[PDB]
Structures are given as structure tokens and as C-alpha cells.
Ligand binder design. Structure first.
Ligand SMILES: *[C@@H]1O[C@H](CO)[C@@H](O)[C@H](O)[C@H]1NC(C)=O
Lengths: 50, 49, 49
């Protein structure tokens, strides 16, 4: 956590429905958006911290 | 059984409740009392207070 | 019914998803209760159910 990874994702078509198959997490916690509506609007940049 | 907490099966029961439009046929354990007319009283008619 | 733990939150009014779009869609004006409990001891089988 003191050396947290930060990967920039860009120039690709994002499908957020495969995250449930990728990870055993129970649910999202989305603040500015809704996790069901994430498959419609297009973003400029997205950063995955880990 | 080796799956995670998000891939484990869950049993779901959904209880959908109708309004009082029809006769209140499903009503909980409340004992009905005698009707009193022509007086300022509190009333509880089928959940309508 | 029986679902996965990922898609428990899809059983809600005004929500979209796999089972919420193709299996069981709740009216946005759903007046009722949803009771979901874990059944990893019963529904799961070793090697897959
Ligand atoms: C993750 O990567 C491994 C690598 O072989 C693969 O077997 C597995 O199916 C992938 N997905 C999950 C959810 O583990």
C-alpha cells in the first residue's frame, strides 16, 4: 500500500461486465457513476490503482 | 466449494406484497375489537390508522 | 430461485444485468422484500454443480 501500483488504461474498448468473472468480489463501490451504467458512457482516461 | 465468496451460490426468496385494493386476505396477528360508533375514537381498519 | 453471490445486487428495482435482464426482472415500483442467504453447504457440489 505504500508502493501502490498505478496502471493507465487507454485506447481500448472497455467492457466492465467481465470483472465479476475476473475477481471474486461481491460488489462494486462506485461514487461518481453507477456500475450498471458503466457500459454506455465513454471516458477520456482510466487509472487502475492496486 | 473451492470458489470465492462472490461465486458461492445464494438462495433468494422474494416476497412481493399487493396493496389493499382487494380484500385484505393475508393479515397478521392482530386481534380485532368491537366497533364503537358516534364517538371520537382512534381506528385501525386493515392497517389504515 | 438460486443465483451467484456476484449477482445478488441485481435483484433490485431499477437495476440491469445478466439475470436482471434475462431471468428475473423486478418492476421499478416493487413493494416487497428480498431475502438472500448463503447456501454453500447445500447447492454446491465437489467438482461442480
Ligand atoms: C487467471 O489466469 C490463469 C492463468 O492460467 C487462468 O488459468 C485463469 O482462468 C484466469 N482467471 C481466473 C478467474 O482465475
Amino acid at each position: 500500500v505504500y508502493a501502490w501500483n498505478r496502471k493507465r488504461i487507454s485506447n481500448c474498448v472497455a467492457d466492465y461486465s467481465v470483472l465479476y468473472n475476473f475477481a471474486p468480489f461481491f460488489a462494486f463501490k462506485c461514487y461518481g457513476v453507477s456500475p450498471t451504467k458503466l457500459n454506455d458512457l465513454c471516458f477520456t482516461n482510466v487509472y487502475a490503482d492496486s | 466449494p473451492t470458489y470465492g465468496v462472490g461465486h458461492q451460490p445464494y438462495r433468494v426468496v422474494v416476497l412481493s406484497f399487493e396493496l389493499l385494493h382487494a380484500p385484505a386476505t393475508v393479515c397478521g396477528p392482530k386481534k380485532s375489537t368491537n366497533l364503537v360508533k358516534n364517538k371520537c375514537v382512534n381506528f385501525n381498519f386493515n392497517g389504515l390508522t | 430461485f438460486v443465483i451467484r453471490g456476484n449477482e445478488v445486487s441485481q435483484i433490485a428495482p431499477g437495476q440491469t444485468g445478466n439475470i436482471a435482464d434475462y431471468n428475473y426482472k423486478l418492476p421499478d415500483d416493487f413493494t416487497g422484500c428480498v431475502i438472500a442467504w448463503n447456501s454453500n453447504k447445500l447447492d454446491s457440489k465437489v467438482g461442480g454443480n
